[PDB]
């Protein structure tokens, strides 16, 4: 509270580390369904069903332009990518499988990088 400061982690490396994690995401062979925005004019239903579309290139732009206040808001957008994927795609499909794989891949890198 007021004048009662909690010790908090050094956050000076977070921007660089998040960029590093995102690069690893982008270069994963199963990243292809998530590299670019889903084309709202070619994919029926997507615009109406998915209220907050997100993809790696949008995340990269926001990261590079100071639009994440902290690492937690960055993680929310990454997870949003895979939550959207589950909403629109069957688990037993190429894209569906891709999503589960990429989520698992992210969460380990997240733990290994920041949960010291
Ligand atoms: C992640 C996702 N969810 C729902 C719909 C699309 C997509 N990916 C886009 C890139 C996409 C857009 N078009 C195609 C055509 C064959 S796979 C594929 C993938």
What is the DSSP annotation of 41-99? TTSTTHHHH-SS---HHHHHHHHHTT--SSHHHHHHHHHHHHHHHHHHS-SSSHHHHHH
Q: Are 74 and 68 contacting, i.e. CB atoms less than 8 angstroms apart?
A: yes
Q: Are 76 and 59 contacting, i.e. CB atoms less than 8 angstroms apart?
A: no
Q: Can you give the residue range of the structural domain that contains 91?
A: 1-116
Torsion angle of alpha carbons 90, 59, 11, 69, nearest 10°?
A: -110
Report the nearest atom of ligand 1 relative to the CA of 32. 10
- Closest of 9, 23, 40, 34 to residue 94, by C-alpha: 34
Identify which of 34, 95, 98, 102 to mutate to test ligand 1's pocket (most ligand atoms within 8 A of the CB). 95
Resolution (A): 2.0
CATH for 113: 1.20.920.10
Q: How was this structure determined?
A: X-ray
**Domain count within the chain:** 1
CA angle 56, 80, 82 (to 5 degrees): 75
Q: Which residue reads 């929310």 in tokens? A: 76
Report the nearest atom of ligand 1 relative to the CA of 43. 5
């Amino acid at each position: 509270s007021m004048s009662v400061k909690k010790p908090k982690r050094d956050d000076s490396k977070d921007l660089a580390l998040c960029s590093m994690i995102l690069t690893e995401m982008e270069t994963h062979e199963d990243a292809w369904p998530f590299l670019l925005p889903v084309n709202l004019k070619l994919v029926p239903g997507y615009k109406k069903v998915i209220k907050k579309p997100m993809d790696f290139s949008t995340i990269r732009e926001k990261l590079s332009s100071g639009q994440y206040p902290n690492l937690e808001t960055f993680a929310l957008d990454v997870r949003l990518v895979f939550d959207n994927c589950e909403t629109f795609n069957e688990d037993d499909s190429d894209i569906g499988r891709a999503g589960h794989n990429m989520r698992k891949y992210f969460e380990k890198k997240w733990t290994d990088t920041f949960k010291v």
